[PDB]
Structures are given as C-alpha cells and as structure tokens.
C-alpha cells in the first residue's frame, strides 16, 4: 500500500487541489489522505466564492492526532497552492518530521506562485512566499512541477529558450529536487503556434541524467485544476515507472489530454455553439475520465534530449 499525504484546497463544486488529486490517485490504488488546506464553495475563477481556511495551528493539530495514533508514516507528500506563509512553514516542519519517520518518503511539491498570460507573468500569491519556497520548501522537495513562470521566479533568471530552460532546471536540481518538470512554457514548437511545451529532467545515480520534451496541442479555453492533476499523476506514474521520466511524463500528459478532450467537448456542447464556455462548464470531467486515468492511451510521444 502506497500512502500519500496530500495537503491542498477543497472546493465543494468542481475539481481543483485535493478534488483534482484525490479521485485519480484513489483510482490508481493509492492510499491518499487529503488534508483540506481550505474549503470553498468553488474555485476563485468564478464570479463569486465563499469558504473557510485552515490555519497553521489547525494543520498542526491534525498532524498531532495522526502522530498520536502512529499514522504519521507516509510514502509521499503532495502539496500545491497555498496563500499563507505561516501555513507553508508548518507544512515544511511536517515533511521534515515525516521524512525522519521515513527517509524514503518522496515529497512532491507543486510550487504554485503565479503564471504568464500573454508572455507576462504575475504572481497570485503574496511575495513573502517566494523566499520560503526557495529556502525551505524546494530543498526538501524530491519532485517539483513548476510551470515556466514559477521556474523563473525560483531561479532568478528568465527562460527564453529550451536550452536556457534546461539550465534553469539544473539550478533547481542543485537546490535539492532530483526530478524537475516544467508543466507549461511559451517555448516555440516546430509543430506550430498552437502548442505549449513541457520539459522534464531527472537526476538518478547508476550519476545519470534524463531529459525529455513534449509538445502538447493547445486547447481554446482556460482550465483550473490541471496543474494539480499533472502533479498528482506525475506522482502516480513516476511511482510505477521510477527511472523512466519518459513514460511517466507520457502517461501523465496523455491522462490530461483525454480529460481535457472530454471536458472541452461537453463544455462546448452545453455552452451555446459559438459561445465561449463558462468556468462552470469548463470544470474537469474527472469522474467521467476514470478509465483514461486507470490506463491512459499514449497519444504524445516525448523526445529525449
């Protein structure tokens, strides 16, 4: 049994954070325990939203209960979006402790900080978080999944090309994580302008390095939860395929493809044909993608670099 302590948001309607991470990991047989960092009616991409958060003391309270029963032994830890600096610090103390309890623990960190829209990036988290991430979180992380913007912020240098991107990943590797994966980038593709690029690098002794590239066909709308889903599925596939970033990223990415495909279709069907689908209609068709998650048909071959 593989246990995962996943600490992320919970929303009542929709799929983001733990909602996007849990089902798929459960479907793939993991014992994922979800610590809901917040509980909102839905994600902030909607016009409205209400909810309550979980403060650092409550997080600790929860960990203590787990400790008391000797349930503080996990195989992986998964974290994503957080707005509170106090919360992040508490998360760090927990991974450290869980790591002492089980040194083999793999910490999967999604350093959610911001994104680039047109080519300009803007953080959607307070700045005081960046240093914590650079100095406390990443060093403890074994696997990190930043998008292009987050990889830039974390290293201090802009990524203009693929080679610059790979240099930035090298920097992150030295910061601690043995597995780095850029989940999206403005990088150009020879396949056309309708593409976003994914880059992945893994450091594993034998020391041997593995680097892969993937050119994903862009879809018309804006999704929410896909980053979180990418992180959880990476966790899942690097677990079944350790020492194979290639396949692990192919299954991860193929899973997302199917899900988004199913989502964009039903989304356009509901929305009046010719009309841009709303955030509500654009919620991931998670439940309906069950079979694609269990065994994703590979539809994007990754090229070795």
Ligand X SMILES: Nc1ncnc2c1ncn2[C@@H]1O[C@H](COP(=O)(O)OP(=O)(O)OP(=O)(O)O)[C@@H](O)[C@H]1O
Task: Name every residue whose Cβ is closer than 8 Å to that of residue 298 and which is 6 or more positions away in sequence.
Answer: 250, 251, 254
Burial state string for 283-296 with b = 16 or more CB within 10 A and e = fewer than 16: bbbbeebeebbeeb
4, 187, 256, 293: which one binds ligand X (CB under 6 A): 256
* 147 is a site residue for ligand X (CB under 6 A): yes
Rounded to the nearest whole angstrom, what is the least distance from the CB of residue 195 to ligand X in the complex? 9
- Piece of 172-180, 220-228, 233-241, 243-251 that binds ligand X (CB under 6 A): 220-228
In the list Mg ion, Na ion, a second copy, none, the entry touching 219 (Cβ below 5 to 8 angstroms by class) is none
Q: What is the DSSP letter of 288?
A: G
Residue nearest to ligand X as judged by C-beta position: 227
Judged by CB under 6 A, does residue 230 bind ligand X?
A: yes
Residue facing Na ion at closest CB distance:
183
3-state secondary structure of 136: helix
- Contact between 53 and a second copy (CB under 8 A)? no
Provide, rounded to whole angstroms, the least separation between the CB of residue 50 and Na ion: 26
* Residue 40 within binding range of a second copy, rule CB under 8 A: yes
Question: Near a second copy by CB under 8 A, which window of 33-41, 148-156, 166-174, 215-223?
Answer: 33-41
Sheet holding 179-182, edge to edge: 51-53, 31-40, 3-11, 76-79, 106-109, 143-144, 179-182, 195-204, 208-217, 303-304
Question: CB of 105: closest distance to Mg ion in angstroms?
Answer: 28
Chosen from Na ion, ligand X, a second copy, none, partner binding at 171 (C-beta under 5 to 8 Å by type): none
Sole binder of Na ion in the list 37, 145, 228, 263 (CB under 5 A): 145
Q: Where are the beta strands (DSSP E) in the chain?
A: 3-11, 31-40, 51-53, 76-79, 106-109, 114-116, 121-123, 143-144, 179-182, 195-204, 208-217, 303-304
């Amino acid at each position: 049994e593989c246990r995962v302590l996943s600490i992320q948001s919970h929303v009542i309607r929709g799929y983001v954070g733990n909602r996007a991470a849990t089902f798929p990991l459960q479907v793939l047989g993991f014992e994922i325990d979800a610590v809901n960092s917040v509980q909102f009616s839905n994600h902030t991409g909607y016009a409205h939203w209400k909810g309550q958060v979980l403060n650092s003391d409550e997080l600790q309270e929860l960990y203590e209960g787990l400790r008391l029963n000797n349930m503080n032994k996990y195989d992986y830890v998964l974290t994503g979006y957080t707005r509170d600096k106090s919360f992040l610090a508490m998360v760090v103390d927990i991974v450290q402790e869980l790591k002492q309890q089980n040194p083999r623990l793999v910490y999967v960190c999604d350093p959610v900080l911001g994104d680039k829209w047109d080519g300009e990036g803007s953080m959607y988290v307070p700045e005081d978080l960046l240093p914590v991430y650079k100095e406390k979180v990443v060093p403890l992380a074994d696997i990190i999944t930043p998008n292009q913007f987050e990889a830039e912020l974390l290293s201090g240098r802009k990524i203009h090309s693929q080679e610059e991107a790979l240099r930035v990943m090298d920097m992150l590797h030295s910061m601690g994580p043995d597995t780095v994966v850029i989940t999206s980038s403005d990088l150009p593709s020879p396949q056309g302008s309708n593409y976003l690029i994914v880059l992945g690098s893994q450091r594993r002794r034998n020391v041997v390095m593995e680097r892969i590239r993937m050119d994903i066909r862009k879809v018309d709308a804006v999704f929410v939860g896909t980053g979180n889903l990418f992180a959880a599925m990476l966790l899942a596939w690097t677990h079944k395929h350790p020492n194979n970033l290639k396949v692990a990223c192919e299954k991860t990415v193929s899973t997302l493809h199917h899900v988004l495909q199913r989502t964009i279709q039903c989304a356009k069907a509901q929305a009046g044909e010719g009309v841009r689908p709303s955030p509500m209609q654009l919620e991931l068709r998670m439940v309906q993608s069950k079979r694609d998650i269990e065994d994703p048909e590979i539809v994007v071959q990754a090229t070795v670099l």
